[PDB]
């Protein structure tokens, strides 16, 4: 278990349209997986095969929840579109979202110049060496998370590559990312856009909502 921590910085703003008009203030682990998948497959790194299968977890790609001036990552509040920091009391909020109207199109985007958390918990050191290579490509050539990647949006660049061994710190959890616990309430929607079948599947799995322990969406925090 050798997890690669970091704080990514948005060099260019990102756009995550979710559902019913609402957007996503920070990018999620889904986007991280997908982008690392692309980087791996386009560089023919072997691990790419497993990344197709979503029901996996030898490398769990947790979300890109933002970090603050209080150091500690922002955390999802009880039924709120805001993420008050644990230490200190600053909110992330929908003040990062901006309605953009460009050449007829009308989408929304989160402003750039922010600092988010990189946390890829590697369960077995088997794939940690390939994890070094994917964070090498991110360290040099950036990683583009979100919509309009070919147009240039979502330019995240890592600023620290701290490869730290971590424990599953199970205890007793907090659901730091809305997860599909059987038939919970919040509707969660994903995608498996596979190249070499041209197959785009809008998969949906209803579950719980972040703001309320087999190892470490599906994240957990001490409470």
């Amino acid at each position: 278990m050798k997890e690669i921590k970091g704080i990514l910085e948005s060099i260019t703003g990102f756009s995550i349209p979710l559902d019913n008009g609402e957007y996503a203030l920070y990018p999620a682990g889904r986007h991280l997986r997908g982008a690392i998948g692309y980087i791996a497959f386009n560089l023919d790194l072997p691990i790419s095969s497993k990344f197709l299968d979503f029901d996996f977890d030898d490398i769990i790609f947790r979300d890109l929840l933002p970090i603050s001036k209080c150091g500690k990552i922002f955390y999802p509040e009880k039924n709120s579109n805001s993420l008050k920091c644990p230490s200190c009391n600053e909110i992330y909020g929908s003040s990062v979202l901006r309605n953009i109207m460009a050449r007829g199109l009308s989408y929304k985007e989160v402003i750039e110049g922010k600092k988010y958390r990189l946390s890829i918990i590697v369960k077995d050191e088997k794939y940690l060496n390939e994890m070094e290579a994917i964070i090498r490509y991110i360290l040099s050539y950036g990683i583009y998370l979100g919509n309009k990647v070919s147009k240039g949006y979502g330019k995240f660049k890592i600023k620290e590559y701290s490869i730290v061994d971590i424990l599953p710190v199970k205890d007793s959890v907090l659901l730091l990312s809305d997860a599909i616990i059987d038939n919970g309430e919040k509707d969660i929607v994903f995608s498996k856009k596979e190249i070499s079948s041209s197959k785009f599947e809008i998969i949906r799995k209803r579950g719980k909502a972040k703001g309320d322990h087999n190892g470490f969406f599906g994240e957990i925090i001490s409470l």
């Binding site: 060099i11 260019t12 309605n99 240039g152």
Partner: protein, 194 residues
């Protein structure tokens, strides 16, 4: 596999304008300017690049004779076998090229300068309307990164002629007034495994 890494560096030769697209940042400038320049929240000026590259290659490759999808209309669909539709994408398959925004190297208050434009009554020979608009100075340096994956050998040459077209035609807005006359430079490299 193989992937191209065309790092483009622009230098502005005549004043640049690309309009601001965030509604809130626009309206928080419509008190002062009437045409604010597109700006990041890191106070850097970003220009759309993919559309310009695509448009230039579409126009050029069409005039040469090669069947390309003109996507400058309201077609809302290209096809999948075009010379540009392989490179700058199609509505079923992603692009081989992933063109990035031409972000600046300097911040605003060092590149962007408010300006005055006029409308002159042809008989009175005096100003009818006056308006403010922002612009990027000449000599200002911008950078981008084209990321053609699965290179097709002609791809680099097509991207650099596209660049020659956007040096003749211009990037940004107000291109018939004299704005946006630029000068690119290419330093390409083929990234591979590690």
């Amino acid at each position: 596999k193989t992937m191209k890494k065309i790092y483009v560096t622009m230098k502005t030769l005549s004043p640049l304008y690309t309009g601001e697209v965030r509604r809130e940042d626009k309206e928080a400038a419509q008190k002062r300017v009437n045409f604010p320049v597109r700006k990041t929240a890191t106070n850097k000026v970003l220009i759309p690049f993919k559309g310009a590259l695509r448009s230039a290659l579409e126009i050029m490759l069409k005039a040469k004779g090669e069947n390309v999808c003109d996507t400058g209309e309201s077609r809302a669909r290209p096809c999948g076998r075009c010379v540009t539709c392989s490179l700058f994408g199609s509505m079923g398959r992603a692009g081989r090229a992933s063109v990035d925004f031409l972000i600046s190297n300097d911040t605003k208050e060092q590149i962007v300068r408010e300006s005055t434009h006029l409308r002159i009554e042809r008989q009175t020979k005096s100003a009818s309307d006056t308006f403010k608009g922002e612009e990027v100075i000449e000599g200002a340096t911008f950078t981008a990164t084209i990321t053609i994956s699965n290179p097709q050998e002609k791809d680099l040459s097509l991207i650099q002629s596209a660049l020659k077209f956007i040096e003749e035609n211009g990037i940004g807005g107000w291109l018939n007034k004299g704005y946006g006359r630029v000068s690119f430079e290419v330093k390409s490299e083929d990234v591979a495994t590690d």
